[model samples]
Target: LFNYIYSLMDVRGKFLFFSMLFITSLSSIIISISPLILAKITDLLSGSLSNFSYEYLVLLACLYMFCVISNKASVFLFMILQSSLRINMQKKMSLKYLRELYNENITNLSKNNAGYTTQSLNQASNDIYILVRNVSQNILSPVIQLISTIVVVLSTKDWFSAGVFFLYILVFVIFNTRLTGSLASLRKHSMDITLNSYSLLSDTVDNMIAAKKNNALRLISERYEDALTQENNAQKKYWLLSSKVLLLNSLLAVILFGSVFIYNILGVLNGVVSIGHFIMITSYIILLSTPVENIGALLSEIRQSMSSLAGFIQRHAENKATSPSIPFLNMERKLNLSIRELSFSYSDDKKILNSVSLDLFTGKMYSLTGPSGSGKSTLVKIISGYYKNYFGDIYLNDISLRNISDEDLNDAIYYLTQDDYIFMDTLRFNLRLANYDASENEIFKVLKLANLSVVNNEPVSLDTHLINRGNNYSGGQKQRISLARLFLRKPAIIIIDEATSALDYINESEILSSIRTHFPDALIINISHRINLLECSDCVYVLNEGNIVASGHFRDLMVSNEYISGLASVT
Candidate 1:
């Protein structure tokens, strides 16, 4: 209920939320009053047929019609509110996570718990909707009915019946309270088991392709079965305990109902209460017990909802940094990159980069060559402003890289990583991300340079549709498409992180030559393990153990650096 109200406060279309709440609440109150009106109609019909008159009967019929219409309206309004809140909350939470957390942080969070984060977000929105709907209709309506019943009983009957009704309520409260803590604990444990099972199932499916390739299907299946077994065991234990509690609660209800009926009989026999009064009191008692009997069940659901909500809230909280950082917004200006004594380590035991310093001037081509695990990718990330906790400074021209807004930095420099993403859209739309206003001629020029002129020969031409992650395209084709995109952007500085690794020798040579010929005045930073590509670079820096041991013309490095010399000799 609190979450629903919070959403109502934060949502942009708050008036719609409030209007729904008002309409639903009014309908619920009217529904509660219907029973009292029915009770009055019963008295009128039974007392004296002709003396009663038909006016009361007609009024009761009209009230019944009104109740049916209002109930339907309430349901429609509640459904709208529920769906709107769930979708809006999910969207807002996802946006917050994307803006606040780093890519590594997000990957780590997802890896540690599998799909737990996603499930929590989904469940939280669902549970909150249920909570709001029940509180308004089931929970609050019963309370209102109880209050109205008490007032009607007190006004019409002797004080003693009202006193007995209060006693019944007291006993119900005592028993319900006793079961609250146990039910809450059981609910929380049940939710944890369920979420864990979901996480394990997601992990199994996500790795299914790999498992099949390795012929580990049976192993993966066994793992999934074990998780399911544990989840089922937890659920069984919770239900067993809950059933026991329900038995005890039912026993209390029996005693209260029996006592109330017996006492009412005694009052009627002694002439202290009329038959009508007795009937009315019995009806009221049953109505009141409706809420009492179900309170324990509702409390259990509330606890489960809260558990899911807490998990979602925790994920959102983890994404929030102490300070807000602006995100990259533009990609296109002259970008000069410099690193001064920058250092970073993943952990105390794994230092990736140590005091790396370099300058990549505009309109110059530089290559980074090293053995595996020498922090070439790490250095590229630092220059791209993806990793910000390094020890020293990075500058773009005269401005500190950190001080230059993320939007400005992205506008000037574009980093094309090895793993490029392909959206499920037309090829034209995919390329247009680099330059939204690019003309067909400009796009074709870049495609031709990248040796992707064959794409235009297709039936769809630039309108060809690519499947998710470009599953429709071959490795070399995807690389060429990515290259064409980079060319379309025409960024002042381009950081290619093994962009040609997926292509064949012929295609790789063609792409490299085209880049040199077309973008002669652009600063090009390349991280490559391929020595042939390095040979074409104007300057080459050899990194060893995160330290630059040698840097000069590639030919000079062949004589000066043992690593470079060995690499050249082998290739």
Candidate 2:
């Protein structure tokens, strides 16, 4: 609880949490007096030959209503606080995790399921919510109630009767704890089986098309079903054991209550207790018994909550990448990037780039051509400052890449990967992400440049809402919109990593023409396997594996580099 809460220690959030805690505590105290007031009302109403005051009864009734209202209001306050804190913390954690995913780390992260990272984030948020609610509502409230009940019972009855009630509660609590201890390992196994089943189902669905094409759907389904069966079996055993423990618990409660009733009768018959006192003692015993009898269940919930909290903490801990050496504050200039003798590898065993150096001029079109795994994309990322952990040096003009602020780097260099992210928003808003202050006319101009003016002829034009990840548009159309966005931003340098690969030949030619026309003064580095695209470039770098084996004019590289020669032959 402390770690999660401390993670959200902003000024307003702290105030909200404390305010909710105060309200909840105040409400619990107010509600605690209700039973004592009811006992007083019973005494007055049942007094023989004594007039009962209607005014007092009405006041007590009103007080009870107030307590109920306050309690609900307090719970609502805590719920709002809990939700707000969880949401804010989730947002912060997500941003932190994203920042940690450097370009080199992204490929490995992507190898997992598409939605696995999102699910992990959601799980962390849910865990925090559960922890907050349980700590405030269940654990804290119960502790306060236990103390209040003890005081109320002892005040109305003798020490012996209170002692008897305490003993019964202690026994019930101990038995519940023991039974809960025996079930912990079983519950953990069941949870693991359930998680595995869920993961398998998700994997199967994600690969359903491939599975069907390969005629392996039955095999996959059988594997999934086997996992589900294991989960179900574990759950069955868990519940069966839980039921037996519950039955034993019920038996104990019955015996304890019956003994307490008999003891009260004996005390009353011996002239050692008044009838009203006996009734009060019996009510307190029953009240205390309710929470004590469910101690096992409550402890189980606490243990589950703790498990979730631990997982959440672990997920948060995984995001601790190297901290920023230089803050972006007081920095307001576009970056001028230069790379010299740069080499990078995702791991020590597999080198991706080797001693590659390139000087990206301020306003020129350069094309990068290489085989499929030749590290062209990785090279673009390194130049864009997305991957900093590399050998050799990259500089923004004279400033080391590591020393330059992230803000300046982002403002100056925009690296558009093959898979560009388009939010579920208006086309205008999507373009505005590149330059928020862009006028509608400016947006339309870039749209025309990217051949999206035809799209603007639709009903909503730029106001049209895109589906999630641009699902409403064709792949080529999404690519064009993303290109238009990049053009609008007009960054100092634009790194296009196979951006036009999905477009038809005519569309790709048009986009290349637009890039040359609209951003003629901006440095454009294009990565493409198409030989036709290379003819328009002033210079080209050809890569093979992790090495840049050749660099020259496209015509020159065609003669010198076999990889380029083969590409030219194919074209």
Candidate 3:
């Protein structure tokens, strides 16, 4: 726990942390000694009222009040320190997680874990706060007070009783900690199940349309129900085990306190101790009970916090081990992309792209046509800054892609897949995401270029809200809405992978032609199996079995390439 705190904190935070500790220890000492003053007051009251001096009594009262107020003041200061530390750490962690998410590998990221990512971060923040609070107040404060009380007892030369007291606490600690390891494991199990359930819930919601259209809503519902059931059972078991531990610890604490009280009573009856000293010892034992009893609860809380923090810490650790920093992409010159002998495999077991190569220049449109599983999509994803673990090199304007930062790479190269998302927001809101500073006239111009007319017919304006990810629009209209974003962007290289497949023939042809006309100086790579689309490209590359089999003009390929002719026949 201390290690994590030290690692995550800055110099100022470390200083504040130590200050809080010092203040907490001072508070504990004040609290431990307050019982002695109380015992003295009680002994004075027990004597004859006429013999008791009001002046001395008033002095003790003032001293006791001072001790109480100082303890409270120190506690308040400690709280302020904790609050500052918690907010600072939370902000830093939040930013770190956001950066990691932005830089995460796209293909792997899309597979799943959004729920776990969000839920774990939130849970981790609270758990870390609990960890800090419990460590200072529940664990350290109690242990410090116990030690102080033992020192005071030892000052009286009561060796035998002090030894007995220390021995009992040592045994209690050993027994208490013995159960925490298993409790931590059980808490971890529950946490995993809970996170899985959250992910399953999010997945079902995202795929609601598919389930409804396929008449599998009932199936999805049952799956979610099963997940919730599993989470519930896991939680129940965790709580049951925790309750048993608490019960056992509580019984032991009661016995310890009661036994000490009985021992003090016998000491007073046998005249082995003075009346005032007897009261002090018994009252001190009573004061110690609060901390001793809290030990079990605090340990349980610590275990639970550890369980929740496991994933957050692991992710933060992974985020720290980033690739070497690269320079921003140079966007001043004409774009020339060269893929040289590039080889890629999703895993070592199966290679996808085998030594593929291409040279694309500005002011032209190119097409990649291939059969299914021919690595067309894979190649485009690699070129668009999604994957970077491939074997060979890709260069933009003679600079290696690996040497360019991801933020700049994304800006220079845009990839528009078939299923481009439309956020559930106003049309203007969505368009502004493409270019935040775009003016109203510029937006309307792009709308005309993409052939989108949200302004007319039904009188749908730019501010009109899109419901359920633009379910109000047809599939072709949704594609066009996404295409409209492209008109606002000025990426040097744009890869459109079947983005226009949802539109009719005329609409698809018109959109593609507009893209070529609008970005005449930009290089565009169109991936499609349609012969009509391939024929419009300045050149076509035919891929088969992870290898490019032919590269030429569409007319030339039709005459010379059997795969091109086969694709033409199919279309």
Question: Which candidate ranks first by lDDT, i.e. highest?
Answer: 3
**Residue 476 lDDT in model 1?**
74
Give lDDT for model 1: 0.72
lDDT agreement of model 3 with the native: 0.80
Steric clashes per prediction: 0, 0, 0
CA error at residue 309 for candidate 1, angstroms: 2.2
Let me know the TM-score candidate 1 reaches against the reference structure.
Answer: 0.83
TM per candidate: 0.83, 0.76, 0.85
> Which runs of model 3 end up more than 4 angstroms from their true locations?
1-27, 51-93, 212-218, 293-310, 316-329, 453-462, 559-563, 566-571
Clash count, predicted structure 3: 0
Least well predicted 10-residue stretch by lDDT in candidate 2: 328-337
Residue 189 displacement (Å), model 2:
7.7
RMSD of each: 4.3, 5.4, 3.8
lDDT of 2 by residue, 158-202 (tens): 666667657766886677667664576676677656666667778
Question: Cα miss at 169, model 2 (Å)?
Answer: 4.6
TM-score order, best first, reads 3, 1, 2
What C-alpha lDDT, on a 0 to 100 scale, does residue 519 get in candidate 3? 82
Q: Comparing 1 and 3 by lDDT, which wins?
A: 3
* Per-residue C-alpha lDDT of model 1 across residues 1-571, encoded as one tens digit per residue: 3754464445444554565567756765776666566666666776665633577777776887798788787778777876675565556656655554443342245455537756655566576666655554456555666677668777886566667667766776676667766766676677777788888887777777889899998899888899889888878877887788778767876776677778889988998866766777776666566556445546656666666566656655555333244465343356677889888876558778878888877778899978788988878877776656668888776767766565566667778886877778988888898899999988877778778778536633788889967979988788778888888765677788998898888888888777767776678989898887788787999889988878889888888877788888884
Q: List the residue pairs that clash in candidate 2.
A: none
